[PDB]
Design a binder for this molecule. Structure first.
Ligand code: BCL
Ligand code: BCL
Ligand code: BCL
Ligand code: BCL
Ligand SMILES: CC[C@H]1c2cc3[nH]c4c(c3C)C(=O)[C@H](C(=O)OC)c4c3nc(cc4[nH]c(cc(n2)[C@@H]1C)c(C(C)=O)c4C)[C@@H](C)[C@@H]3CCC(=O)OC/C=C(\C)CCC[C@@H](C)CCC[C@@H](C)CCCC(C)C
Ligand SMILES: CC[C@H]1c2cc3[nH]c4c(c3C)C(=O)[C@H](C(=O)OC)c4c3nc(cc4[nH]c(cc(n2)[C@@H]1C)c(C(C)=O)c4C)[C@@H](C)[C@@H]3CCC(=O)OC/C=C(\C)CCC[C@@H](C)CCC[C@H](C)CCCC(C)C
Ligand SMILES: COC1=C(OC)C(=O)C(C/C=C(\C)CC/C=C(\C)CC/C=C(\C)CC/C=C(\C)CC/C=C(\C)CC/C=C(\C)CC/C=C(\C)CC/C=C(\C)CC/C=C(\C)CCC=C(C)C)=C(C)C1=O
Ligand SMILES: COC1=C(OC)C(=O)C(C/C=C(\C)CC/C=C(\C)CC/C=C(\C)CC/C=C(\C)CC/C=C(\C)CC/C=C(\C)CC/C=C(\C)CC/C=C(\C)CC/C=C(\C)CCC=C(C)C)=C(C)C1=O
Ligand SMILES: COC(C)(C)C(=O)C/C=C(\C)CC/C=C(\C)CC/C=C(\C)CCCC/C(C)=C/CC[C@H](C)CC/C=C(\C)CCC=C(C)C
Ligand SMILES: CCCCCCCCCCCC[N+](C)(C)[O-]
Ligand SMILES: CCCCCCCCCCCC[N+](C)(C)[O-]
Ligand SMILES: CCCCCCCCCCCC[N+](C)(C)[O-]
Ligand SMILES: [Fe+2]
Lengths: 240, 281, 302
């Protein structure tokens, strides 16, 4: 009857939907490659989807996916086994080379813009009207790393104007230069800011930015990748 | 095979047990010590279920059902053919689940990401343990746990529910449902928002997260923000499951009468208990 | 130590944001309300402004009328006595007109008419609100995803109190406006139909409701897990993939063998949720009209 017809129809619709959804989720990272970078023999039952184009705002251009995929940077890694499926060891310094949990992506070297075309993230000292409205104000607190040594002090907070949210802390090292630290990787306390991901001797290694008033998508990745990588790589210096 | 950007992430390290011994992949799947443990507990578990199918005298997927020890055996051991198998498969299930969570923990470490996912999965494990371990023990018998069968586990739900009348009247159950409904409201709203911003009116340019905040402030006068919504979604989900576990652990333990009667307390309050009219007087 | 990013550590505030203009008639956009420091700990602290055009006022008015119509009825039942009102608040109920009246609109005010009046207000309140979700998106030039997904919820609601009572032939088939009574109606509905556990659509609907909690738990936890690389800025990660999007995809591929993309995951989302009430609506719609006993039906599949 009608019911058995409906459920039968529904199961067919569902299969078509799952198919449609999986193909839509293949717009990045595909085709699959072998560890050497050449296309792999087996790609799966799902065909690559027909390209779509995004019209970026603010005259930033266009993006078409799927499209030509390339890292656009060298990868300091070497094989550790004569067969695939094994880890690739870093040939140099993983933190500096940006590999493993220290990896960064070659994103455009321009800052993210808000709806009006202005820079989304700015140091608070340039964001007129912004101020700390609740919680402990970090500006002035010394910064301590996982090795219990002080590496510097917070000289400002970089805010997200559109979404009124603190995103970075600007820290000044012993040499007088500053570095940015992701908000989600620091613990603000009553008498200090603690950074577990890094040890004092590693703060100077954080990637520096070009302009003192803006961060680009590319520099954000390099800084966030670097500080995330410390959990594994700075581990031997983490005496706690 | 690897995704186009995957190689740089496949570095060694992050394992909780065994060092480099199991630090490898099989296709897209990462292994690790807990990858082997999961496999072990899983294989042994399916075998017991097949063995159970023979003893039950069926091979049909809809018919196979592994029942727990009958109330008579208490919190003790029962013969394989009636409760024993269930007990061991339950140990295997617990082992598989906990191993899975830890596998996720190792994958987090290697990728250098937070542990939020494994943490969220643990609430699921908690709810399962509440039904087959915590409640049964507090009620003094494995017999109160549900059977491992596609249709049979549904009978259990109905029978356990109706044992206290209409289970709707369980206060905690009421709360758990509200979160399950709200979570779906939020999941629908979130998916729709991001997509409406990424796929604007034909020919136009991509909207920004500012357009998203504006849309929600125009619609209901408030926007929780891009970070808030992911914090909200995680919270609604874990709450729905927390209250579900709570609603069942209080049932048959501290409260074993009809759930509808529980509400009399409010109606019986002194100051209004004796006033003619309405519905209760 | 170990910051989870569930709650903000520090709060920042700047001038109230009036939002993007686009084609929005700014004459209908109210002023900004107060800033909530409480809410600011979890998400945004700003309240308002809110756009309130004609369709909004209509919706907002019909809604109060619906709520108020049910309200005076509860009062009448409470013998106007405030103590009784608060005591029996959950037991009160505004029932549909008796089966004898069928689909007629000529039922006494005290025995069905008020319910028909309340329903009319709710009907207007809900449909005007839908039209509103479509227009607020248009004025900003964004897709209509929110309006279509909302329609999925309207479906089940439309079926429960309008489409089904109509096909059955009487308003008595509808849901009563009462907290405890609508729970009773749900239980009664299952029993009268041979137990909904045998309705395959009910079973699917449940799979999706459970699936939605599974997915949002997975999604939310994933985003917070990568918030340290700016993961919540989903739109920009779609336009220019960052390490946040890569690590998120890789965690999943290594765990279960496959993954999604920043944009792709929101497609799984909107569908997982929308299917809950879509399948459900069909299951309810067939109950009583075509299949009068699901257990029987499930036996011969006739
Ligand atoms: C789905 C199949 C059944 C059914 C079965 C059930 C069952 C079973 C249960 C409910 C429950 C509820 N049902 Mg019902 N329900 C149906 C159809 C409906 C319809 C409808 C228009 O069709 C409505 C309006 C409701 C409404 C309601 C609520 C009273 C309650 C929670 C809903 C929710 O979580 O929304 C979430 C979405 C929101 C936007 C939130 C709305 C506002 C909330 C409810 C209150 C304000 C909270 C505030 C914002 C924050 C806190 C403030 C402080 C307290 C001050 N039901 C049909 C007939 N319903 C539960 C209950 O507790 O009943 C008593 C319950 O256990
Ligand atoms: C006739 C039935 C009774 C009733 C009886 C019960 C009873 C009895 C129970 C509930 C429970 C629930 N009820 Mg009730 N309930 C009724 C009507 C309703 C209505 C309704 C609209 O009328 C609704 C919305 C609900 C909603 C709910 C939820 C709050 C809850 C189920 C979710 C849950 O517990 O997740 C919990 C999640 C899990 C257990 C999942 C665990 C997953 C594990 C960890 C991993 C699996 C791995 C693996 C096997 C997967 C496959 C692997 C392959 C490789 C692919 N009830 C009526 C009144 N209700 C249940 C509950 O609250 O449980 C605590 C419960 O026991
Ligand atoms: C004893 C009870 C029966 C039973 C009878 C029913 C009945 C009857 C129904 C369900 C339905 C559902 N059941 Mg059941 N169900 C049982 C056992 C279960 C079990 C269980 C663990 O065994 C579970 C998990 C469920 C789960 C579910 C859901 C999948 C589904 C509701 C979807 C929904 O989101 O509605 C919530 C959402 C809506 C109603 C949409 C609302 C849209 C409108 C536009 C909102 C307007 C709001 C506005 C007016 C403001 C409100 C203000 C208020 C004052 C707050 N059932 C047993 C067998 N169940 C429904 C279904 O779809 O069946 C197929 C249904 O009708
Ligand atoms: C949660 C509260 C109640 C309960 C109440 C209900 C109700 C009510 C219903 C279900 C339904 C389902 N339940 Mg149950 N169920 C419970 C506990 C469980 C557990 C468990 C380990 O705790 C499992 C594995 C299941 C599994 C299942 C599926 C057969 C089915 C769809 C689930 C779904 O879509 O979720 C969402 C999850 C996903 C989309 C992820 C994929 C999960 C897959 C589909 C799980 C496959 C399990 C497999 C067949 C058996 C185990 C693995 C094998 C041994 C290899 N239930 C407890 C006792 N269950 C529905 C049904 O149709 O059953 C006939 C239904 O109507
Ligand atoms: C796909 C189905 C799922 C879903 C989706 C869904 N719902 C939706 C949408 C979507 C995609 C919307 O876009 C739409 C929305 O506007 O969200 C913000 C909506 C919506 N889903 C809602 C509720 C809702 N949805 C439900 C369920 C579901 N919705 C499913 C989970 C339920 C359940 C579980 O039964 C409820 C209760 C609304 C918040 C909203 C529809 C708004 C609406 O139509 O209102 C009309 C107008 C009135 C009722 C008048 C309001 C007058 C105000 C003054 C009231 C203010 C609140 C009041 C409590 C104050 C009282 C006084 C105080 C001092 C205490
Ligand atoms: C916060 C709670 C919510 C949630 C979240 C959640 N679930 C999760 C996660 C998260 C965050 C994961 O990271 C994890 C995942 O990896 O998903 C892809 C997972 C997961 N949630 C799953 C299922 C699931 N979650 C459920 C519920 C929920 N999960 C909630 C809604 C349900 C419900 C709704 O019923 C189910 C069925 C799995 C797909 C997956 C975990 C997979 C796993 O643990 O692998 C190890 C085990 C095996 C491969 C098989 C073991 C086989 C045997 C040893 C036993 C088999 C028999 C069994 C014990 C009984 C079967 C009886 C039934 C037929 C009745
Ligand atoms: C924004 O970011 C995000 C992503 O990407 C950038 C994502 O991808 C995802 C993930 C989400 C999706 C891909 C969407 C689709 C997902 C669902 C609908 C959830 C339901 C999932 C499933 C049905 C799959 C379940 C499969 C499992 C648990 C394993 C399957 C394995 C086998 C059949 C083989 C057996 C494997 C074993 C025993 C263990 C491993 C083996 C070893 C040898 C070790 C999220 C949350 C996300 O937010
Ligand atoms: C974009 O979308 C939007 C929404 O949704 C999609 C929204 O909802 C809202 C508006 C919503 C809110 C302001 C509230 C948001 C939060 C919730 C719905 C969840 C609230 C719950 C918790 C955080 C968990 C803690 C539990 C609580 C507060 C409830 C506790 C229980 C009771 C009050 C019931 C009575 C209990 C008694 C007598 C016992 C008490 C003692 C013990 C439990 C011990 C907005 C503006 C919105 O913009
Ligand atoms: C404090 O006291 C005052 C008076 C000040 C108050 O404000 C009190 C107010 C209350 C006590 C309000 C209480 C509100 C509730 C408890 C409401 C509960 C409602 C439910 C739980 C409802 C559940 C389900 C309802 C459904 C499915 C309704 C469906 C409606 C329809 C689809 C509409 C169909 C339309 C019809 C029949 C009429 C069509 C007419 C035409 C002319 C086209
Ligand atoms: C709810 C589950 C829905 C189906 C999910 C799995 C679909 C097939 C995924 C294949 C992924 C393949 N791969 C690794 C080659 O890309
Ligand atoms: C009553 C059925 C409701 C189905 C809702 C489906 C929502 C799909 C949203 C994505 C498709 C959007 N689009 C481009 C057509 O607007
Ligand atoms: C897009 C995700 C799709 C997930 C589908 C999950 C289906 C679970 C099995 C449902 C079985 C239903 N039944 C009994 C009605 O046939
Ligand atoms: Fe998202």
């Amino acid at each position: 009857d009608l019911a058995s017809l409906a459920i039968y129809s529904f199961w067919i619709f569902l299969a078509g939907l799952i198919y449609y959804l999986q193909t839509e989720n293949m717009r990045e990272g595909y085709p699959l490659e072998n560890e050497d970078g050449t296309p792999a023999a087996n790609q799966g039952p799902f065909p690559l989807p027909k390209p779509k184009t995004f019209i970026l705002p603010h005259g930033r251009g266009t993006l078409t996916v799927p499209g030509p995929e390339s890292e656009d940077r060298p990868i300091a890694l070497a094989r550790t086994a004569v067969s695939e499926g094994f880890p690739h060891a870093p040939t140099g310094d993983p933190m500096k080379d940006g590999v493993g949990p220290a990896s960064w992506v070659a994103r455009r070297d321009l800052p993210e813009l808000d709806g009006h075309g202005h820079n989304k993230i700015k140091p608070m000292k340039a964001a007129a009207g912004f101020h700390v409205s609740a919680g402990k104000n970090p500006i002035g607190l010394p910064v301590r790393g996982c090795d219990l040594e002080i590496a510097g002090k917070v000289v400002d907070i970089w805010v997200d104007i559109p979404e009124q949210m603190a995103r970075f802390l600007e820290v000044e090292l012993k040499d007088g230069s500053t570095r940015l630290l992701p908000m989600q990787m620091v613990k603000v306390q009553s008498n200090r800011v603690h950074v577990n991901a890094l040890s004092s001797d590693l703060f100077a290694g954080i990637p520096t930015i070009k302009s003192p008033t803006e961060v680009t998508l590319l520099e954000e990745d390099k800084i966030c990748g670097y500080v995330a990588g410390g959990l594994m790589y700075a581990a031997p210096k983490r005496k706690s | 095979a690897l995704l186009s950007f995957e190689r740089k992430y496949r570095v060694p390290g992050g394992t909780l047990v065994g060092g480099n011994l199991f630090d490898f992949w099989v296709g897209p799947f990462y292994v690790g010590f807990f990858g082997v443990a999961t496999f072990f507990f899983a294989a042994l578990g399916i075998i017991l279920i097949a063995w159970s199918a023979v003893l039950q005298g069926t091979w049909n997927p809809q018919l196979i059902s592994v029942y727990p020890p009958a109330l008579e055996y208490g919190l003790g051991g029962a013969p394989l053919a009636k409760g024993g198998l269930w007990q061991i498969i339950t140990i295997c299930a617990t082992g598989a689940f906990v191993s899975w969570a830890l596998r996720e923990v190792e994958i987090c470490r290697k990728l250098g990401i937070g542990y939020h996912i494994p943490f969220a999965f643990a609430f699921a494990i908690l709810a399962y343990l509440t039904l087959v371990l915590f409640r049964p023990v507090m009620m003094g018998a494995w017999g109160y746990a549900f059977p491992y069968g596609i249709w049979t586990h549904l009978d259990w739900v109905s029978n356990t529910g109706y044992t206290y009348g209409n289970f709707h009247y369980n206060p905690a159950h009421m709360i758990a449902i509200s979160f399950f409904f709200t979570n779906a409201l939020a999941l629908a709203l979130h998916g729709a928002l991001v997509l409406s911003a990424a796929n604007p009116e034909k020919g136009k340019e991509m909207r920004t997260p500012d357009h998203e905040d504006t849309f929600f402030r125009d619609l209901v006068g408030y926007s929780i923000g891009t970070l808030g919504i992911h914090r909200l979604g995680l919270l609604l989900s874990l709450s729905a499951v927390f209250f579900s576990a709570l609603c069942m652990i209080i049932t048959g333990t501290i409260w074993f009468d009809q759930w509808v009667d529980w509400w009399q307390w409010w109606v019986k309050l002194p100051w209004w208990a004796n006033i003619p009219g309405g519905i209760n007087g | 130590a170990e910051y989870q990013n569930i709650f903000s550590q520090v709060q920042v505030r700047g001038p109230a944001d009036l939002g993007m203009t686009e084609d929005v008639n700014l004459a209908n956009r109210s002023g900004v309300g107060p800033f909530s420091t409480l809410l600011g700990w979890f998400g945004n602290a700003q309240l308002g402004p809110i756009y309130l055009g004609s369709l909004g006022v209509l919706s907002l008015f019909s809604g109060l009328m619906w709520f108020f119509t049910i309200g005076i009825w509860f009062w009448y039942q409470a013998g106007w006595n405030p103590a009784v009102f608060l005591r029996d608040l959950f037991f009160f109920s505004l029932e549909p007109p008796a089966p004898e009246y069928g689909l007629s609109f000529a039922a006494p005010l005290k025995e069905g008419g008020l319910w028909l009046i309340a329903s009319f207000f709710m009907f207007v309140a809900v449909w005007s609100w839908w039209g509103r979700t479509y227009l607020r998106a248009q004025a900003l030039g964004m897709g209509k995803h929110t309006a279509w997904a909302f329609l999925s919820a309207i479906w089940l609601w439309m079926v429960l109190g309008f489409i089904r009572p109509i096909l059955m032939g009487s308003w008595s088939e509808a849901v009563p406006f009462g907290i405890f009574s609508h729970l009773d109606w749900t239980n009664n509905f299952s029993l009268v139909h041979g137990n909904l556990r045998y309705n395959p659509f009910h079973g699917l609907s449940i799979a999706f409701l459970y699936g939605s909690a599974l997915l949002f738990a997975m999604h939310g936890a994933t985003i917070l897990a990568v918030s340290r690389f700016g993961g919540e800025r989903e739109l920009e990660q779609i336009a220019d993939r960052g390490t946040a999007a890569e690590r998120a995809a890789l965690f999943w591929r290594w765990t279960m063998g496959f993954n999604a993309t920043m944009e792709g995951i929101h497609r799984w989302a909107i569908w997982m949720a929308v299917l809950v009430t879509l399948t459900g609506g069909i299951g309810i719609l067939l109950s009583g009209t075509v299949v009068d006993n699901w257990y029987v039906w499930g036996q011969n599949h006739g």
